[PDB]
Design a protein around this ligand. Sequence first.
Ligand code: CHL
Ligand code: CHL
Ligand code: CLA
Ligand code: LUT
Lengths: 222, 221, 34, 257, 60, 50, 221
Amino acid sequence: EFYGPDRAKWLGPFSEGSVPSYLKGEFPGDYGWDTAGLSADPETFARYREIEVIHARWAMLGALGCLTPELLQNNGAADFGEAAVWFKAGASIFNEDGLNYLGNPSLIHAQSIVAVLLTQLVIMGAAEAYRYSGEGPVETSGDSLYPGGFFDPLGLADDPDTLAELKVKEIKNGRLAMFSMFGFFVQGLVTGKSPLENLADHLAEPSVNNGFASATKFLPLP
Amino acid sequence: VEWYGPNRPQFLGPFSNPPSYLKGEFPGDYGWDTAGLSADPETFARYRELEVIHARWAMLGALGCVTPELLQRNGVANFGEAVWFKAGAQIFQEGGLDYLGNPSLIHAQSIVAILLTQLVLMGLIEGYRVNGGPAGEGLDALYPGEAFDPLGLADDPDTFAELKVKELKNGRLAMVSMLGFGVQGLITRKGPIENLADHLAAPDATNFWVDYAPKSAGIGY
Amino acid sequence: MLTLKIFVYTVVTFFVSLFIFGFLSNDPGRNPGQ
Amino acid sequence: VSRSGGWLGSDSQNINLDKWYGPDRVLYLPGGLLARDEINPVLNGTLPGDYGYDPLGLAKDAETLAKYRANELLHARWAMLAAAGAIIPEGLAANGADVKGATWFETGAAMLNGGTLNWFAVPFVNFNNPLPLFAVVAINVALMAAAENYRRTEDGPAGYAPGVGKFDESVYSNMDNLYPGGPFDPLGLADDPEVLAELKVKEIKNGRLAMVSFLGFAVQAAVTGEGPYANWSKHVADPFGYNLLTILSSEDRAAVL
Amino acid sequence: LVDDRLAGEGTGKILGINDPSLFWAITIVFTIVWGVFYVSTREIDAASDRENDDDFGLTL
Amino acid sequence: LVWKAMYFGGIYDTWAPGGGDVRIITNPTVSPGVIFGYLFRSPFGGDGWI
Amino acid sequence: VWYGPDRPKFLGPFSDGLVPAYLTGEFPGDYGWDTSGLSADPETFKKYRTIEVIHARWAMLGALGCIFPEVLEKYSGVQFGEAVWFKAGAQIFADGGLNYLGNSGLVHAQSIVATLVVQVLLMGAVEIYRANGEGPNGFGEGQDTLYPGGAFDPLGLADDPDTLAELKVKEIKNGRLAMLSMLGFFVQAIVTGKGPLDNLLQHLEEPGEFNFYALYANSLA
Ligand code: CHL
Ligand code: CHL
Ligand code: CLA
Ligand SMILES: CC1=C[C@H](O)CC(C)(C)[C@H]1/C=C/C(C)=C/C=C/C(C)=C/C=C/C=C(C)/C=C/C=C(C)/C=C/C1=C(C)C[C@H](O)CC1(C)C
């Protein structure tokens, strides 16, 4: 159903003639969608698949991270101020009290923009360099995209049949996260309010408070 | 070996897993094709030519985008608009466009003459570059030499190979700086030389992260 | 009177267009000699 | 592969040497006025710019023609440098540039009494050239005397030129007295024999144009007393009001009516 | 005034176009006639028995 | 003709302010509407074509 | 004329040293322009070729549809709510709704969601048929997915294969012109803020005074 010839497709029942020959349902997420033939060459397809999974994984982290502080702010679990909104959390580091995790000054209490940036360059630079290398001190399998071993403490990938199906779950939850993250970016740019405030307004008046309410917000003026 | 072959340097230092198609056969091969854009040998060839042409243009642009401003800041010369993203507007000023401010140089007055002449001049030049012409035909596309290497600095094959790597590395650095000029100019709205002076004057207060980053969402710059 | 003017403009243009494209239709070839 | 090519696309290189060399070479008079058998036989169409023009029969043999062609090419090349160099600095001053001694026939006086000249590297900064008159006379004479003696003796010192890199005295051997090439052709535009033959025609033709032009610059200086740029700028400004006839008039012509 | 008139006399209007509707009257008619002419050129030339090359047309 | 009217003395203008005189034409009318207005004007009275 | 090795090319006399090998002249609109090597792979070239023709046919409808109401408002008695193409969307939020040709008896649409639902249902079904290659009950089985003909050629203007080859060049060249002009409509809307007809009529009032360089160029930086 998610692999092989009769797998699910991007156009559903009407996707017989739209599936490229190079897409044969061998990898996770193969709904036969490449109307631009960008993955015709096998080598470029493999690299694009890695980029998609890495993006999908960052988006799943990003989608959860862009809502968790705001949810805590709403129910009263913590206080962030303007930093509750995801597209305003950056300036927090420039607050006199500093970026306090969960609003607690006894936590990180970071003050230096340089320090948070240089630290990330060293850490993520090392972590990403090992990923590109394909080798490292940790124990991994031969698949760079799917290391396992050290990165699979719970043996959820041990069963090979479940691993193939769980791969579809990762990319499908991942692609939804990427689409929603693009929604967070555009809604932040267009509406200027947090994603949960956008949701609340749609619920308050769905027929009026929708995207077309801001359709004329960027009319070029003479 | 140092700049070509399997012992060449890589974009990620020790962590080096060069793509198979990247075999250190061309200048500036640090094994960086993580997106796999140049997997096709024909496309890679086309991409290498674009990089060299972009690099040479960027090198001319980077020097040309600071030279009028450096002369102005140092009081060496007066320009109608020294800042690069404002130099084009000089044609619409009163006396027109005077080179180095001296009314006896160029003294251009109409943008149509500038545009039409550039269309003819650059149209022939680029045609000569791709189809060959007065300077020669059958010459290498990216490294023609001959009339374009009068000093013969590329006579030694070994020196030519190393100097080609230098061209890309200086060129790639120039391309990054050009993006910086554009982004910095679009944000600071000030010339790049002036921006550098500001950072040197008070780096902890005029940095982008402190000066504009906090006003990039909900508040204007 | 505008209705009359538009009608005449339509009519005059029609006959002039036939005259123009009539002579553009290989007129010189329409002769009985060879 | 070639170092030469056309200017207007593929197959745009059409160098016709027949019009400038050989029996059908163009002549100073058209076909219906001058028959080709009336041309001096010593002018056989082997030298650049052989328009078959030599009244008074000055060239009566190949040696005499070769000796005079050595003179013509040198007088032509100097006139090309002079024509360009006599009017370019004056045009700068008339347009606002700071040039002392703009007109060519007044630059010498500017160096008198210890005065100096400003050399304009036109695209870029100007220079307050410190060389005094005594020094300029000494350096110019020394460099020119040495340069001309090397041409006269057909031998010179070893040195560097970009086209040939580093060369020794051996290169001076086997150099044409008029078309040395080698170090004197850094861009290597003389490689193609057909291109070289055509470019030789352009050299004397631009050269002969320059020689007659400088003659006018001199005659015009004596008559109008102004620089060549001033004469041109005012002919273009008011052509019928400012020409030779108006100057010769030298009086307010009474209205005829 | 007492009556209504076009009042376009002696006003120097291009092609006498006082109102934009006259433009559509001329343009539509010319396009139609040009349209039927355009799709018939090949047939008309075919009668000549020659192809409309660089040597076509009455020539003495 | 335009060089004569703009750079070399000028053309006699009978409509010149202060009386008809030779005048330098500094602002020639090159607007498409004016030019096309004369070309496709009626030849009848009041219009007179060109 | 338009096919084979003797076809015209995009750089004219200089378009001979950069015509790719894979661009041979078998497809309409082939001027040998692939300087970036994007269509080196035949499969990607095939798809890119369909995308161009589709972008071209939408552009031709878009170019005509973006100027026709503006032409009709100035040169006819029709009074649209918004004749300008980049303001016609807001008509559906007006009190009277979107009235076709300004007539309240035509369409009279008043809810954007209903129009969107009908559009995605109609365009979704239609675009599926083109993608899958067969419509409902195998409507288009066997017909070309880019050049169907049959029901899409009621007038039979392309029955002769030789006429078809010629007319496909006309379609792509009018389409490429429309795409390039739609870029003009987009940028001129952003910069001038007026309709494309207004921009044209302003150029024609006084071309020297009313053009991009004399009005807006200075403001863009
Ligand atoms: C049965 C009909 C059916 C149809 C019509 C579609 C249609 C689509 N599916 Mg799909 N699917 C269908 C069935 C099924 N899908 C899937 C599983 C999937 C997956 C897993 C995915 C899709 C995706 C997609 C989309 C492909 C990308 C895209 O943008 O397309 C072309 C569409 C357009 C160009 C839209 C045109 C615009 C539209 C009219 C909206 C209006 C736009 C604005 C008003 C304009 C504003 C302008 C301003 C901003 C200047 C697409 C719209 C992909 C997706 O989610 O993409 C987003 C995708 O990843 N489908 C299954 C399960 C087996 C199906 C089962 O029946
Ligand atoms: C629109 C008005 C306009 C004006 C008034 C000028 C004025 C000038 N331009 Mg300029 N330009 C103008 C527009 C434009 N220019 C250029 C591009 C250039 C370039 C590339 C150059 C100039 C140069 C110059 C200067 C040359 C004078 C000089 O120093 O000569 C000094 C004297 C000489 C060079 C030689 C003598 C010149 C004199 C006219 C003699 C002519 C002899 C001929 C045999 C005449 C032949 C006539 C024909 C009919 C038989 C000068 C002040 C030059 C410069 O920078 O000067 C330093 C230069 O190189 N302009 C463009 C871009 C298309 C323009 C667009 O509008
Ligand atoms: C439309 C006028 C016209 C045209 C098309 C020709 C064409 C030709 N002439 Mg002829 N000719 C003309 C007028 C013209 N001529 C006039 C007015 C005279 C009297 C001076 C002559 C005297 C003449 C002679 C004696 C000969 C020719 C010859 C020739 C043939 C080629 C060689 C040549 O160019 O010689 C002539 C070259 C020149 C006269 C050089 C003149 C310099 C330039 C071109 C003057 C241009 C000034 C300017 C544009 C004039 C302004 C316009 C004016 C009306 C106000 C050629 C077919 C030759 C021939 O027939 O071979 C057997 C030949 O022997 N012509
Ligand atoms: C060839 C080549 C080669 C090399 O190699 C590389 C390179 C260079 C890359 C290439 C190039 C390319 C290009 C040029 C591209 C461009 C494109 C475009 C512009 C498109 C458009 C495109 C465009 C388009 C479609 C458009 C469309 C439109 C439409 C549908 C519609 C619209 C509308 C209307 C009607 C009206 C209203 O009121 C509004 C609307 C609703 C809005």
